[PDB]
Symmetry: C3
Subunit: 232 residues, 3 copies
Amino acid sequence: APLQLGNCSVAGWILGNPECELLISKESWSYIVETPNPENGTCFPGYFADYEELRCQLSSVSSFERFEIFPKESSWPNHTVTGVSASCSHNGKSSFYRNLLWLTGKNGLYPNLSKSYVNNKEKEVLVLWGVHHPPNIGNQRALYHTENAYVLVVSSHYDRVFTPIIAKRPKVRDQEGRINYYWTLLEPGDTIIFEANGNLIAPWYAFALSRGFGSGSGSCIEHIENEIAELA
Amino acid sequence: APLQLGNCSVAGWILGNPECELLISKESWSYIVETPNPENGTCFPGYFADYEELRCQLSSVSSFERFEIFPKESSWPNHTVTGVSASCSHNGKSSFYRNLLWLTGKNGLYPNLSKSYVNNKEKEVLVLWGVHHPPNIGNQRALYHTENAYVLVVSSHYDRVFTPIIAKRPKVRDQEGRINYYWTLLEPGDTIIFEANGNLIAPWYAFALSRGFGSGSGSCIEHIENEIAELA
Amino acid sequence: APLQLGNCSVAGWILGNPECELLISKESWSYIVETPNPENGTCFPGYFADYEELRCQLSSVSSFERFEIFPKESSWPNHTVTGVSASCSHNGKSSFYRNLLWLTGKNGLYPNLSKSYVNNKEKEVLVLWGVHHPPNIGNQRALYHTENAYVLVVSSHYDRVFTPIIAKRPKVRDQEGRINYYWTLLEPGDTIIFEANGNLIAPWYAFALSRGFGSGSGSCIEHIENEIAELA
Ligand SMILES: *[C@@H]1O[C@H](CO)[C@@H](O)[C@H](O)[C@H]1NC(C)=O
Ligand SMILES: *[C@@H]1O[C@H](CO)[C@@H](O)[C@H](O)[C@H]1NC(C)=O
Ligand SMILES: *[C@@H]1O[C@H](CO)[C@@H](O)[C@H](O)[C@H]1NC(C)=O
Ligand SMILES: *[C@@H]1O[C@H](CO)[C@@H](O)[C@H](O)[C@H]1NC(C)=O
Ligand SMILES: *[C@@H]1O[C@H](CO)[C@@H](O)[C@H](O)[C@H]1NC(C)=O
Ligand SMILES: *[C@@H]1O[C@H](CO)[C@@H](O)[C@H](O)[C@H]1NC(C)=O
Ligand SMILES: *[C@@H]1O[C@H](CO)[C@@H](O)[C@H](O)[C@H]1NC(C)=O
Ligand SMILES: *[C@@H]1O[C@H](CO)[C@@H](O)[C@H](O)[C@H]1NC(C)=O
Ligand SMILES: *[C@@H]1O[C@H](CO)[C@@H](O)[C@H](O)[C@H]1NC(C)=O
Ligand SMILES: *[C@@H]1O[C@H](CO)[C@@H](O)[C@H](O)[C@H]1NC(C)=O
Ligand SMILES: *[C@@H]1O[C@H](CO)[C@@H](O)[C@H](O)[C@H]1NC(C)=O
Ligand SMILES: *[C@@H]1O[C@H](CO)[C@@H](O)[C@H](O)[C@H]1NC(C)=O
């Protein structure tokens, strides 16, 4: 039972690109069907880290659930949660991915961010977030009132620090700057911790994946050895 | 002739996890047998770099030898070589991997470390080392008497610098901090150089691998093309 | 129709190692034939990034064209374009890769470099460049009159900053220092931007690749699923 998907890419589907009306009551799947030359992927162009592995850790999924992880109403009273960009306009209305929140400062200097989530779903949780990369220091200051910020993400098995690189690139969809996307799988019983002083796009929704026994570690090269074994 | 292994992972076996009584007169093997859901892997939880490739560069091995590379008695007269952690307790006794030495300072400021080894085994040598990542600056100071240190590893074909990131993670096996593992293959005739001013877990033992003709470059994706060729 | 290649590696061929007389009227190919234990690869030893993927993005190619991207005569009036090294000596004459230019300063402090190229070939363009890593600060100063420099490379889909690490390694081909190689595929209509204040080896020639329909994204793991599908 292959999952049916339109003119969108997996990145668009998982990030929550408004242009993709994929919000349907679909649970498990054996395959993902994707247009070989998709258009509706990332609203704000940029690099999607480990994109190949995310089409291998979701190549076969059992029970699949979308749930809210960090509600905008209560999670960030001291920050702006309306980082809307006309980069894309569903119904001609500027909007952002429906699973992410682009946070900015207000009144004074961007207040420090310290939040965490504990996985009590009894399933592995896929958490997605981004890092903002301004085209200019003046724009970085406009959003965060600083010229120097970092994003740190910590879990039991994954730990990385992200540094924003300010530089102007060729315009893509009229964007001079760029957003990079990162993700990790949070094991049951663990905690994901986010710490930042600016240039953070926070997770809003997260996905719980049963996975089942359709794969091994899920990583690619582990979805081939099994395919070869099946032929042999 | 598959290699028999208990409830341990390859990481545990190669690092020297005391809980794994795998110290047997075993040389060559055609396969590695590993429990699909292993428990006895890394004593001090953390990230193991390039773990998939180390189960592909050792997927098929001819002559295999464990030898001492940097003896604790003579290699570090100016450092502590007893970085024991109760993280694990063989016979209920706190101990560390039997192939690695966690070095710390003594008396004064952690003395600078400059050591090297020349490969004269006529075989490729697998060298493993780690980098310490404190949960707090106070703990970094307790061990090294500094708040700023780096680890540099240089060879003919591999050259990387490691920077420790101090941050507290969720406790794993009661550990607030974390150790990352790195490795490289040193070609015959080359030299591996270690330079550091703190936060280093030095290699103690190293492995000489004949490898033979059971693989190509050894890298994965090079252990599949050959498998497909065999089917075809 | 496999491409015939001598005692050289792909890295040597694409970089332009003088010792490799592969400058022939060869266009498309279905396979690349390479000596399993090649000798004539990189003149100045060092690390070649993403080398496996460059033997998978060129595993099958249709029309293939070598063209000049940044002519030495007009592109750098304020820099030295004769960074010759005796590392190798075709006809016993010190020379450098015939697709790269090792730039150095002159008279005063290495002038800042800002250059770009727009892809109007209607084909994907493969751009190669390098980063210099001195064995000593004194040598870095001799070439660039500085002790601190960086290289930044920006495109629509790729954006990375390179930091040189000064350290002495074991001599390889009598070289105490080392050069690392990096590359990216520039899509039609995009622009590649190079910005640096030292330690840059600039692209001189670039390749236009038709590619055709002999592969998918071209990435490895995407050249295997197709091979397995063919068997099945
Ligand atoms: C994809 O685009 C084509 C052409 O506009 C359209 O006919 C098709 O319905 C689209 N797919 C979906 C799911 O809307
Ligand atoms: C979605 O794809 C259509 C082409 O069918 C394009 O016109 C539109 O701009 C795309 N929107 C986004 C957000 O990519
Ligand atoms: C917002 O700032 C006030 C200090 O003015 C602080 O007491 C409060 O806890 C902060 N709220 C959040 C969510 O950080
Ligand atoms: C966030 O906390 C760090 C110390 O951990 C501090 O140096 C930094 O200035 C704080 N951020 C802001 C905007 O004050
Ligand atoms: C692995 O664990 C099981 C269950 O305790 C035990 O019976 C088995 O002997 C263990 N394997 C080894 C090699 O000790
Ligand atoms: C080894 O595995 C056993 C479970 O059989 C567990 O109780 C013990 O704590 C583990 N020791 C280490 C060092 O992982
Ligand atoms: C230990 O320190 C002394 C200086 O007090 C130095 O002479 C000696 O060479 C050092 N030994 C090592 C192994 O670094
Ligand atoms: C190690 O040597 C470097 C210079 O290469 C020096 O800056 C550093 O302070 C030394 N380490 C210690 C603990 O003094
Ligand atoms: C490769 O080296 C061998 C041995 O010197 C030589 O005979 C052969 O002609 C070389 N290949 C090419 C293309 O020159
Ligand atoms: C090319 O290979 C030959 C061995 O046939 C070797 O003697 C020569 O030094 C190599 N030249 C380069 C630039 O690698
Ligand atoms: C060379 O330097 C002069 C300033 O003396 C500047 O006007 C000129 O544009 C520079 N040329 C290039 C190619 O950077
Ligand atoms: C290159 O420009 C930067 C500012 O973007 C400046 O800080 C740097 O010093 C310049 N390089 C040189 C050699 O002056």
